[PDB]
Amino acid sequence: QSIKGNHLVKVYDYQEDGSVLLTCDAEAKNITWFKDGKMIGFLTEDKKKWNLGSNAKDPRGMYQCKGSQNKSKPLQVYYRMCQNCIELNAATISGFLFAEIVSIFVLAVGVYFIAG
Amino acid sequence: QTPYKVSISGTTVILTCPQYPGSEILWQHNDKNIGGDEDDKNIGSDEDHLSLKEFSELEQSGYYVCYPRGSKPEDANFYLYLRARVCENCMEMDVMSVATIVIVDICITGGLLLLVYYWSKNRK
Amino acid sequence: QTPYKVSISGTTVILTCPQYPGSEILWQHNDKNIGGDEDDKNIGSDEDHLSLKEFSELEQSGYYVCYPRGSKPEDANFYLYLRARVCENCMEMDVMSVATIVIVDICITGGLLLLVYYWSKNR
Amino acid sequence: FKIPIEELEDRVFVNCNTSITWVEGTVGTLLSDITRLDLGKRILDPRGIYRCNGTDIYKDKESTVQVHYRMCQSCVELDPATVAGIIVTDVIATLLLALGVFCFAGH
Amino acid sequence: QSFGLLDPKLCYLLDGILFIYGVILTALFLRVKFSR
Amino acid sequence: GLLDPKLCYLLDGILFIYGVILTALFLRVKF
Amino acid sequence: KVTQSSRYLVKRTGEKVFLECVQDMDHENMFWYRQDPGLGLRLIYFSYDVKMKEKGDIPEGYSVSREKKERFSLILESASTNQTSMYLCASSFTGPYNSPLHFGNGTRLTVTEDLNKVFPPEVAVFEPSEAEISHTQKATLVCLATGFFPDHVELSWWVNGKEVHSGVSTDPQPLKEQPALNDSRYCLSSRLRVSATFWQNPRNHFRCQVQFYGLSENDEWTQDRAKPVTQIVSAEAWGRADCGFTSVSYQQGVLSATILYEILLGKATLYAVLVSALVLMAMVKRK
Amino acid sequence: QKITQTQPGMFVQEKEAVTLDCTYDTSDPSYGLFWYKQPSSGEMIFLIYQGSYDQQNATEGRYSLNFQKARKSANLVISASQLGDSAMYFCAMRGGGSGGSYIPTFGRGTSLIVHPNIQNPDPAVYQLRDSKSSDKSVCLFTDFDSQTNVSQSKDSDVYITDKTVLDMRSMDFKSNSAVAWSNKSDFACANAFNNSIIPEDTFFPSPESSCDVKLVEKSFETDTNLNFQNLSVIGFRILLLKVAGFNLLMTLRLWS
Ligand SMILES: *[C@@H]1O[C@H](CO)[C@@H](O[C@@H]2O[C@H](CO)[C@@H](O[C@@H]3O[C@H](CO)[C@@H](O)[C@H](O)[C@@H]3O)[C@H](O)[C@H]2NC(C)=O)[C@H](O)[C@H]1NC(C)=O
Ligand SMILES: CC(C)CCC[C@@H](C)[C@H]1CC[C@H]2[C@@H]3CC=C4C[C@@H](OC(=O)CCC(=O)O)CC[C@]4(C)[C@H]3CC[C@]12C
Ligand SMILES: *[C@@H]1O[C@H](CO)[C@@H](O[C@@H]2O[C@H](CO)[C@@H](O)[C@H](O)[C@H]2NC(C)=O)[C@H](O)[C@H]1NC(C)=O
Ligand SMILES: *[C@@H]1O[C@H](CO)[C@@H](O[C@@H]2O[C@H](CO)[C@@H](O)[C@H](O)[C@H]2NC(C)=O)[C@H](O)[C@H]1NC(C)=O
Ligand SMILES: *[C@@H]1O[C@H](CO)[C@@H](O[C@@H]2O[C@H](CO)[C@@H](O)[C@H](O)[C@H]2NC(C)=O)[C@H](O)[C@H]1NC(C)=O
Ligand SMILES: *[C@@H]1O[C@H](CO)[C@@H](O[C@@H]2O[C@H](CO)[C@@H](O)[C@H](O)[C@H]2NC(C)=O)[C@H](O)[C@H]1NC(C)=O
Ligand SMILES: *[C@@H]1O[C@H](CO)[C@@H](O[C@@H]2O[C@H](CO)[C@@H](O)[C@H](O)[C@H]2NC(C)=O)[C@H](O)[C@H]1NC(C)=O
Ligand SMILES: *[C@@H]1O[C@H](CO)[C@@H](O)[C@H](O)[C@H]1NC(C)=O
Ligand SMILES: *[C@@H]1O[C@H](CO)[C@@H](O)[C@H](O)[C@H]1NC(C)=O
Ligand SMILES: *[C@@H]1O[C@H](CO)[C@@H](O)[C@H](O)[C@H]1NC(C)=O
Ligand SMILES: *[C@@H]1O[C@H](CO)[C@@H](O)[C@H](O)[C@H]1NC(C)=O
Ligand SMILES: *[C@@H]1O[C@H](CO)[C@@H](O)[C@H](O)[C@H]1NC(C)=O
């Protein structure tokens, strides 16, 4: 991560709200941002960081910033936080089996009675 | 260009570097060289891969860079920012997995219901 | 004392200056003039209210002051300390609203069921 | 001449050089230091109006500050498509229930 | 200690509604069974 | 206290089956 | 405002070292001082005005250049372990009437006889004990940075990505591992005290950061291990609630409930389709 | 022309006034005295100045200078001392720079230490949890009184730091602390501070753990995703209830 080498994009993480922010090293007042090549917006002297939203949505992609001189080298961001991963411990499987057997028995009785 | 491939299977995370075909690869984490002939079995490197075993989110999240031997880290054209959480057994509940589970539960439930319906009709 | 009026909708925050009903006003945030520049689309100052669009919690939170035009902006002695967490499509609702919507849904379903049953029983 | 509002670890405090007078809103808790008032955690949305004096060059002039917080502990994201789906699904379910009632009514 | 839309009053509200329905219905059933 | 939703889920799981069984039984006994 | 070239410097014996001092208050008299433990401030060199070089109390082994009014540079022609100390620069007007000195920030300079002895620190973080939390409702995290040389480190605490200044205590000076004998490495410790409720929130992130000043990119390195250059070494921790009900447990429970209710809804709608088909078939076949 | 400071090292309690002495002698009739402060960082900060041909001692904030020309004594007096006054104080004087004696001279320097008022002593020796990335064993001597001073460890492989003052503005709490650590199997630090004269009734925690679930649930907070998931669960339950009602009605329709 060296300025000499055209590496300007940095990640500004670990915030109280969970958002992911990007910072551009360029000193120009207005900075334009690109994601996978296509422009995604621009910022002025008031705002210094680009918001990628919450990290629970797994922000992934390639980002660049350009203020005055040229486009910085792409930075690839990859997130994998398991906001949906499930721990397969004893309690989960026990509850799953209990629910399955109870529901199957109830449905079996219901379809037994209406038979014929 | 061609981005890195990140494969996660349990607590093992594998990074794959498509660039520089046929050139031996060096890997850096947070400006520290890793993957070399160091006395550690958790971190491994071959022709073009980097395997991190028992991944720790706090210690191993950050910047990874791939460069051919004899070059400079800043001359590499990519940096990867990786932040991940891993489990021994955490199977993920996305749309496709939920759809698959619902579909299979429906098919076994329907098979059992039809079998018991035919048994009841034959008995009575 | 008549307080400031703060309205938050989506990512838009509107602040109202209470104590100056009949004169032009200026707004200042963290010792820097804001609004009224006829530019910076995300910030506007119409009538006697300051409108802030695409509000950013990290950069746009802090002190706000309203003072009449022509007066040095330190004689003012009533500031507003604003810290707001805004969100796109994020709307706030309390537990009472959810409880009442569930209750009225159950009640309307029961009433419709009773009406349909009474209509279908006779015929 | 702004009354300093400070944000320590997870709470919010009001700081003056003299006793702080509460005008309205959150009552707060004193720190055993008269010149400091604790309004509690930030996620609980402390809102109020407070007033105090000054020192040094500010011998003989008041100041009033209004604290207003908004943190969305009860906020929830709701896209219009999602709510449209919610109402249409609920209407379909209640129509199905009414149809079942009508079919059961005869027998 | 902020719950937001996680306060345990909600699912317990649903459970209380279901409980009230169940108890009134079983009382009606029991009365009908003893009467007949 | 008792903010654990496990108890809430167990309670409504019991109440659901109890309610449907008694609904069927009563609706037959009346008719 | 008086500024110097740098605050920390490490060099090898026999090299040439340059120190710079720049002021902008239009001061005539300039002083270069050296500070030692138990010796006090000692006047190395003094310059009355431009192009003046006059000897001081300890002038051997040093040189200066005062070719400009606003510049006063110092040169160690042959650095040695004898000259490892802190150097200060001061500026003042002409006339001792109302002209006190105005110092800068200083420069700590260490000269070693081999660059192999430079090592980076090792940073570790130790979490509060539950006994303290139960006894006094407070938590104390301890950061240890050990095994570094020279003692040119700075330490800081970052909570939720923001630097913390309150509730932090750091050692005034790094100590030595084995003070009895020479060529000994250094240790440093820091404490952060927090309320108990803040610590055991699993959403909070605590980090101890140590900035270490070492070799530069213009130094020969012929050793197998990595080059000890200026860098940052960090240690991280999450809030920990070992006993109780936290947000992670609630999230897991809600996810499991969602999956189970989706499965049950699927079964119920399958049964609904079956019974509706049977009703329709009976109605059709009756006629 | 020389300056001497009699006492190296001074201690003062908080919210007090402390006087540091400086005795000088000189031959020229025109000169001046001044003081500098050097904190732990290293910088020298100019504090106070006073000439020879002027009365009405200078005064800046909490600093004052007691000057006695007849006794040739310039003393620095600090009123309402705070915790930031712990530094090294230097006393210096000018000289006749006309003939040969410009030579701004400096004193040796005096250390100052400000001790807080604990107001509630509660000494204890806790042992911190391991790091899982280091083999050291660290433990903490905390909450003791200001007078209790910590001595170094005679053992070579055990490292002990000196006492340090910590301040918590969130609940305006001052405390004293010390840390001891080592790498050895038998390092159980009920005896690490053996060389130090620790006070009486110092708490030594039991190895078993303790908990207070109310305190743990005091630090609970949610986000938007949890609220959305809870609402989703509620909606799923309502839909399942309605579908089950329809199923039951159709079943009693087709009973047999
Ligand atoms: C509460 O009292 C404190 C002091 O007990 C006040 O802080 C002091 O405020 C004055 C401003 O009048 C500061 O003076 C300033 O000094 C700078 C540097 O010399 C100078 O350039 C300015 O023009 C001004 O004179 C003073 O430094 C400051 N004290 C400290 C220790 O920083 C504070 O303002 C009082 N607050 C209220 C609300 O009255
Ligand atoms: C529709 C009728 C037939 C009810 C179906 C069977 C019931 C007995 C089910 C309904 C909801 C189920 C519960 C739904 C959610 C959970 C949360 C789940 O939470 C966990 O504790 C697992 C996560 C962890 O412990 O890490 C444990 C099973 C349990 C109590 C399930 C137990 C079985 C219940 C009560
Ligand atoms: C702040 O200071 C002002 C004075 O500068 C106080 O105002 C005085 O209040 C008393 C009431 O006890 C009146 O009798 C005086 O006439 C007031 N004087 C002025 C000049 O207004 C005020 O009470 C102080 N506020 C606090 C909270 O101490
Ligand atoms: C500083 O230490 C070094 C070595 O410890 C010594 O430097 C000598 O300086 C004198 C100058 O008078 C030379 O003649 C010697 O040749 C130097 N010695 C070496 C080994 O280079 C000396 O002990 C100290 N120098 C001073 C000026 O104090
Ligand atoms: C040199 O020392 C001065 C102190 O005289 C430093 O100035 C301080 O800077 C910090 C910001 O980091 C402020 O909070 C202090 O109030 C300043 N003190 C004074 C007295 O102004 C200065 O930062 C130092 N230079 C460097 C490069 O660190
Ligand atoms: C600076 O302050 C000191 C302290 O008051 C002054 O010394 C006093 O001088 C008077 C004059 O007769 C004596 O009565 C006091 O006993 C002295 N006090 C002390 C503590 O020595 C001193 O005079 C002041 N400086 C000047 C220039 O007047
Ligand atoms: C702190 O260490 C020293 C050991 O010598 C003792 O403190 C002395 O306290 C007396 C009491 O007035 C003073 O007269 C001495 O000047 C102090 N000595 C030093 C070196 O500071 C004392 O034994 C220790 N503190 C306690 C509480 O035992
Ligand atoms: C910065 O560039 C953007 C790109 O369109 C432009 O809209 C904006 O006006 C520029 N900023 C300034 C100060 O000209
Ligand atoms: C910037 O990019 C242009 C082409 O896009 C190139 O000609 C120029 O050399 C680049 N700037 C530098 C400093 O190389
Ligand atoms: C370390 O070695 C040098 C060179 O022999 C010697 O001068 C010095 O005294 C030694 N250190 C100690 C603490 O004796
Ligand atoms: C403890 O760690 C230090 C640091 O490497 C090592 O020198 C020492 O031998 C270790 N002691 C034991 C008993 O392992
Ligand atoms: C530890 O302190 C006790 C105090 O009673 C003393 O008897 C014992 O000798 C000490 N242990 C060592 C190893 O000095």
Numbering used by the authors:
A (entry chain G): 23 to 138
B (entry chain F): 33 to 156
C (entry chain E): 33 to 155
D (entry chain D): 22 to 128
E (entry chain Z): 22 to 57
F (entry chain Y): 25 to 55
G (entry chain B): 3 to 289
H (entry chain A): 2 to 257
What did the study's authors say about this model?
The recognition of antigenic peptide-MHC (pMHC) molecules by T-cell receptors (TCR) initiates the T-cell mediated immune response. TCRs are expressed as heterodimers of α/β or γ/δ chains in complex with three CD3 dimers (CD3εδ, CD3εγ, CD3ζζ) that are responsible for initiating downstream signaling. Here, we report cryoEM structures of two distinct full-length α/β TCR-CD3 complexes bound to their pMHC ligand, the cancer-testis antigen HLA-A2/MAGEA4 (230–239). We also determined cryoEM structures of pMHCs containing MAGEA4 (230–239) peptide and the closely related MAGEA8 (232–241) peptide in the absence of TCR, which provided a structural explanation for the MAGEA4 preference displayed by the TCRs.
Adapting previous approaches, we expressed a full-length PN45545 TCR-CD3εδγζ complex in HEK293 cells and purified it to homogeneity in detergent without chemical crosslinking. We determined a cryoEM structure of the PN45545 TCR-CD3 complex to 3.0 Å resolution. Side chain densities were well resolved for most residues in the extracellular (ECD) and transmembrane (TM) domains of each subunit in the complex. N-linked glycan densities were identified on TCRα (N58, N150, N184, N195), TCRβ (N84, N107, N184), CD3δ (N38, N74), and CD3γ (N52, N92). We also noted the presence of a lipid density situated between the TM helices of TCRβ, CD3γ, and CD3ζ subunits that we tentatively assigned as cholesteryl hemisuccinate (CHS) due to its matching shape features and its presence in purification buffer. Interestingly, the cryoEM map suggests the possibility of S-palmitoylation at CD3δ residue C124, consistent with a palmitoylation profiling study that revealed CD3δ as a high-confidence target. The cytoplasmic tails of the CD3 subunits were not resolved in the cryoEM map, presumably due to flexibility. Taken together with previous cryoEM studies that focused on different α/β TCR pairs, our PN45545 TCR-CD3 complex structure supports the notion that the overall structure and assembly of TCR-CD3 is unaffected by differences in TCR variable region sequence. The only notable differences when comparing the unligated and ligated PN45545 TCR-CD3 structures were present at the CDRs. However, we suggest cautious interpretation of these structural differences because the CDRs are not well defined in the PN45545 TCR-CD3 map calculated in the absence of pMHC.
